[PDB]
Amino acid sequence: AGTAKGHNPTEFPTIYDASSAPTAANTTVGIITIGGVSQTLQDLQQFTSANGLASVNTQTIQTGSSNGDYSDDQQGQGEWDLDSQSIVGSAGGAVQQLLFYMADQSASGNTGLTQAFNQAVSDNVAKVINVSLGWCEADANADGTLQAEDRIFATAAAQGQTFSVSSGDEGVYECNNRGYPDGSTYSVSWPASSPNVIAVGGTTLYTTSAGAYSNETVWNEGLDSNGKLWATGGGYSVYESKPSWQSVVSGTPGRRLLPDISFDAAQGTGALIYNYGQLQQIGGTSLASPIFVGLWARLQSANSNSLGFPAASFYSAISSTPSLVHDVKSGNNGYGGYGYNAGTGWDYPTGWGSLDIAKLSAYIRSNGF
Ligand SMILES: [Ca+2]
Ligand SMILES: [Cl-]
């Protein structure tokens, strides 16, 4: 069954059958960040230069008050590094432009992040926007953040923009102090639980000795030394109603089910990322979402950026056309015998699984999306 190892981001096209697709050279991509990206831009230069790629056109955008705090968060740089290098690698080494929509760190509440989302939608220049972040949806709901941000994502979807959002790293235990085992008590992350975004969960990725895809299982690496679970977020929103396209998954509640799709997330099978100059092997659903973003941006470039928000089409296409995905069947996203189990077809840990990009491209050529 393949081998578990780290991977250069430039390998993700081979792994997910995207090498025959155009690059994302004709599609602009956004990344939501918390604070600045000055070190991240140096790490991105290290990435493209080491891989012999053309340099990436970047812009940074202060999305809130002009007097806000956009200084670099040092630990955050590794996350913006994961996002940006994984997007560019998955995109085949080229994007039209990479836009960093930086959230103010000195704003009240969650308003810095809300303003970053808002700016990406108002500007309506990026076709695909990565969000490798989140938190307990019940906490977001309790202070009004959920409602305010969902309005923004609704505008995005109506405008034809794709927000991609990591499902979470806490398995079913998102709301229990961010991942502490809690028995049968299951919860999900915001903004992944929005029906106006594509929620991306996580796999453990096995490759053959030649580097081809072998298999994927659920991402679940168990507990760390603090006792926190590291596993793919998945479940259903307690607040958001089920969008009609999800009705194809029978026997589920009348709620937004997540994730929609999944890609590599296990640290043990994760991406090799330049962070403050040093190569580190990094996972999370923060990896899986940028993989999706880069791959989806290729399909946008192949289709003149004319593909709208793709949730309905994913559910109709994949339910009727199982060859479009790698269906994850093994593993669970809890602990101690609790959590959801993968299975045939759509499941709570992984949604439909990972996309086979060339097969999806051929489907889109025939059928539209
Ligand atoms: Ca499955
Ligand atoms: Cl909807």
UniProtKB/Swiss-Prot annotation:
GO terms for biological process: proteolysis. Binds 1 Ca(2+) ion per subunit. Optimum pH is 3. Ca(2+) binds at D327, V328, G343, G345, D347. Disulfide bonds join C136-C175. Residues 3-367 form the Peptidase S53 domain. It is found in: Periplasm. It comes from the Bacteria. Pepstatin-insensitive serine-carboxyl proteinase. In vitro can hydrolyze various synthetic peptides. Also shows activity on acid-denatured hemoglobin and on casein. This is Sedolisin. The chain holds residues 217 to 585 of 587 of the full protein.
